[PDB]
Write a structure and sequence with these properties.
The structure is cut from a larger assembly and holds chains A, B, C and D. Chain A is built from one helix and seven strands; from the N terminus they run E-E-H-E-E-E-E-E. By secondary structure, chain A is mainly β. Chain A has a four-stranded antiparallel β-sheet. A three-stranded antiparallel β-sheet of chain A has the order 5-6-7, with no helix packed on it. By secondary structure, chain B is mostly helical. Helix content of chain B is 42%, strand content 0%. Chain B is built from two helices and no strands. Chain B is extended. The longest helix of chain C is centred in the C-terminal third of the chain and has 5 residues. By secondary structure, chain D is mostly beta strands. Chain D has no helices and eleven strands. In chain D, a hairpin with a 6-residue loop joins strand 5 and strand 6. Chain D is globular, with a radius of gyration of 14 Å. The N and C termini of chain D lie far apart (40 Å). Classes of the chains: A mainly beta, B mainly alpha, C mainly beta, D mainly beta. Chains A and C meet through strand 2, strand 6 and strand 7 of A and strand 2 and helix 1 of C. The structure holds a molecule of 3 linked components (NAG-NAG-FUC), a molecule of 2 linked components (FUC-BGC) (2 copies), alpha-D-mannopyranose (9 copies) and magnesium ion. One alpha-D-mannopyranose (MAN) binds next to loops of chain C. Chain A: It comes from Homo sapiens. Chain A: A positive regulator of the alternate pathway (AP) of complement. It binds to and stabilizes the C3- and C5-convertase enzyme complexes. Inhibits CFI-CFH mediated degradation of Complement C3 beta chain (C3b). Chain A: Its main location: secreted. Chain A: It is found in: Secreted. Chain A: Keywords: Complement alternate pathway, Disease variant, Disulfide bond, Glycoprotein, Immunity, Innate immunity, Repeat, Secreted, Signal.
């Protein structure tokens, strides 16, 4: 299946930067492993590097503004051809849940 | 001061590879031992 | 009022890159009619772009894997130095993985040696630590996440010299302890090694997939 | 691979104009994005202007924007730097540079091929 080929993966935001254009296979676009690909302008930009976990995102706002709550942060396996650490396909995620406290009373 | 080191039957010579040749899988373990022995002999000596 | 137009397209550029995808071009000029005293501006673009494909894979430089396990803190051609005032050494190994297609070899030392004492299976006196910082709510996204903190029997490390100066080239070594000791302490709540406690996390938010959230 | 020959320098009065030209190798001309640099007495080499392989996309340093104009002639394997309103601080050896670019509208600031240079001296 053809795909849009981009020249740069930003990684700080997960965006596909520098459109080389389209009408080309995923194998030929990911010969250069510094490139990236996505389908149309819908999103999910995957780099052509071997699959590796991205950076943990910032902690979400606490579920209540009073007493003990719970907050989440994500991490998305980004890459192509292979798996991340833990039998994880490219596109799947991993969460960390932590108890927060905006106001202690 | 014209001392000369002559190579004979009691002399022993082995190549210590460069950094990229050590990354080959045969010279992987070889560069480990010759590097450890360098530290082993400037720290511990002989125990005989 | 003269209407300008495009001229002949020039020679196409060869494919710049030897691997992967690249981009070629053709150049045209607005030189044959030329807009004079006004008019338009030739209508369109003076440049076409096209993707060229060489169909051959590209170099990838090797990366270091994580360090291995430390070797035992013993002496070569001796015995062991467990429960003794003897500083020893131990080694550790890395592996270069992922180097393909004439890529760059891994840069750095593939071995790591540091100095050590040995408290492997050593009976050491202990004291209970204070309550650790509350862990993560596990399992996240699963049914009923719970935190966990714990107190563990921390061994009293013996007051040895942390800095041992050797001679030869006068090299002084930051010496650190290695091994799994046997910490001796009084029982707390029917347990000798580690006593923990769990508390459920309150107001757990539901996990929504970010690709399912954007859409 | 590619060779670069600058021309057009000389001694100009302050406020005057000068047009530099840079000839590159003919068979490999449209492959390389090109630009201008300069190195003043006692100073590091600094970026002046860049042009893509197209001649349609340009980039300029803030010190020369509005005064200098870079152009490209893809018929005659040359680029040009039209320098207007010259000041004594523009006195430098001006270098033509060439660099491999995948995209044809990309302007570069990093270049791996350099000419021998042309001397421009501006007197007040
Ligand atoms: C050998 O030890 C020194 C001392 O610094 C550390 O010593 C430990 C015993 C412990 O107290 C630890 O908290 C302390 O950081 C290392 O030197 C530097 O020391 C400064 C002073 O605090 C630290 O701020 C630095 O982080 C530290 N490291 C640097 C500058 O790289 C030293 O690194 C260490 N190793 C060697 C090979 O000498
Ligand atoms: C964040 O700020 C706090 C000061 C509250 O105003 C929060 O609103 C809710 O207030 C009720 C009591 O009126 C509590 O029971 C809730 O826990 C709290 O969410 C506000 O969201
Ligand atoms: C031509 O031959 C190929 C076999 C590769 O060795 C190519 O190397 C790659 O060149 C492009 C730029 O031309 C870079 O993006 C790559 O990083 C590089 O690996 C060579 O050009
Ligand atoms: C998330 O967790 C830590 C930072 O908290 C690092 O290991 C890394 O940034 C990971 O992405
Ligand atoms: C959440 O926790 C702290 C801020 O409270 C930081 O490490 C970071 O912003 C993380 O997302
Ligand atoms: C140039 O481009 C096209 C022909 O390729 C037309 O729109 C028109 O002739 C214009 O001059
Ligand atoms: C260039 O493109 C085509 C020929 O390939 C024509 O429309 C015309 O000659 C233009 O100059
Ligand atoms: C091994 O050594 C330390 C961790 O002990 C880090 O520098 C790194 O993870 C390396 O692989
Ligand atoms: C060697 O040292 C300790 C084990 O005593 C840990 O930090 C780790 O296992 C390392 O490999
Ligand atoms: C652990 O428990 C208490 C401190 O909590 C003391 O009796 C002693 O430190 C024991 O090791
Ligand atoms: C944990 O519990 C309390 C503090 O919450 C104290 O008794 C002590 O710090 C213990 O470690
Ligand atoms: C966990 O709970 C609170 C922080 O939310 C503190 O009492 C302490 O840090 C404990 O480990
Ligand atoms: Mg003896």
């Amino acid at each position: 299946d053809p795909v849009l080929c981009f020249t740069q993966y930003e990684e700080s935001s997960g965006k596909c930067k520098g459109l080389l254009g389209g009408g080309v296979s995923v194998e030929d676009c990911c010969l250069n492993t510094a490139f990236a690909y996505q389908k149309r302008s819908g999103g999910l930009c995957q780099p052509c590097r071997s699959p590796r976990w991205s950076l943990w995102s910032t902690w979400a706002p606490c579920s209540v503004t009073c007493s003990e709550g719970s907050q989440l942060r994500y991490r998305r396996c980004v890459g192509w051809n292979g798996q991340c650490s833990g039998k994880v396909a490219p596109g799947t995620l991993e969460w960390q849940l932590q108890a927060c406290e905006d106001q202690q009373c | 001061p014209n001392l000369s080191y002559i190579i004979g039957k009691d002399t022993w010579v082995e190549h210590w590879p460069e950094e990229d040749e050590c990354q080959d899988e045969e010279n992987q373990k070889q560069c480990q031992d010759l590097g450890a022995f360098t530290e082993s002999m400037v720290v511990f000596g002989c125990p005989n | 009022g003269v209407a300008g137009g495009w001229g002949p397209w020039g020679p196409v550029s060869p494919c710049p890159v030897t691997c992967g995808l690249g981009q070629t071009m053709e150049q045209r000029t607005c030189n044959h009619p030329v807009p004079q005293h006004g008019g338009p501006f030739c209508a369109g673009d003076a440049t076409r772009t096209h993707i060229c494909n060489t169909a051959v894979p590209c170099p990838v430089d090797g990366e270091w894997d994580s360090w291995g396990e430390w070797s035992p803190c013993i002496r070569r051609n001796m015995k062991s130095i467990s429960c003794q005032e003897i500083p020893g050494q131990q080694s550790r190994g890395r592996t270069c993985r992922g180097r393909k297609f004439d890529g760059h070899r891994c840069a750095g030392q593939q071995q790591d040696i540091r100095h050590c004492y040995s408290i492997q299976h050593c009976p050491l006196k202990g004291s209970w630590s204070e309550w650790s910082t509350w862990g993560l709510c596990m399992p996240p996204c699963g049914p009923n996440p719970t935190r966990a903190r714990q107190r563990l029997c921390t061994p009293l490390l013996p007051k040895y010299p942390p800095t041992v100066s050797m001679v030869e080239g006068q090299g002084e070594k930051n010496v650190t302890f290695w091994g799994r000791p046997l910490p001796r302490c009084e029982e707390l709540q029917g347990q000798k090694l580690v006593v923990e406690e769990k508390r459920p996390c309150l107001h757990v938010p539901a996990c929504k997939d970010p690709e399912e959230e954007e859409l | 691979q590619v060779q670069l020959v600058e021309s057009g320098g000389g001694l100009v009065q302050a406020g005057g104009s000068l047009r530099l030209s840079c000839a590159a190798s003919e068979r490999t001309f449209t492959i390389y994005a090109m630009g201008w640099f300069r190195q003043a007495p006692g100073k590091e080499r600094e970026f002046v202007a860049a042009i893509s392989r197209s001649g349609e996309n340009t980039d300029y340093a803030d010190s020369v924007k509005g005064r200098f104009t870079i152009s490209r002639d893809n018929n005659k394997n040359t680029i040009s730097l039209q320098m207007n309103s010259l000041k004594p601080e523009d006195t430098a050896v001006y270098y033509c540079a060439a660099g491999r670019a995948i995209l044809v509208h990309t302007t570069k600031k990093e270049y791996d091929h350099w000419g021998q240079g042309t001397q421009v001296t501006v007197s007040s």
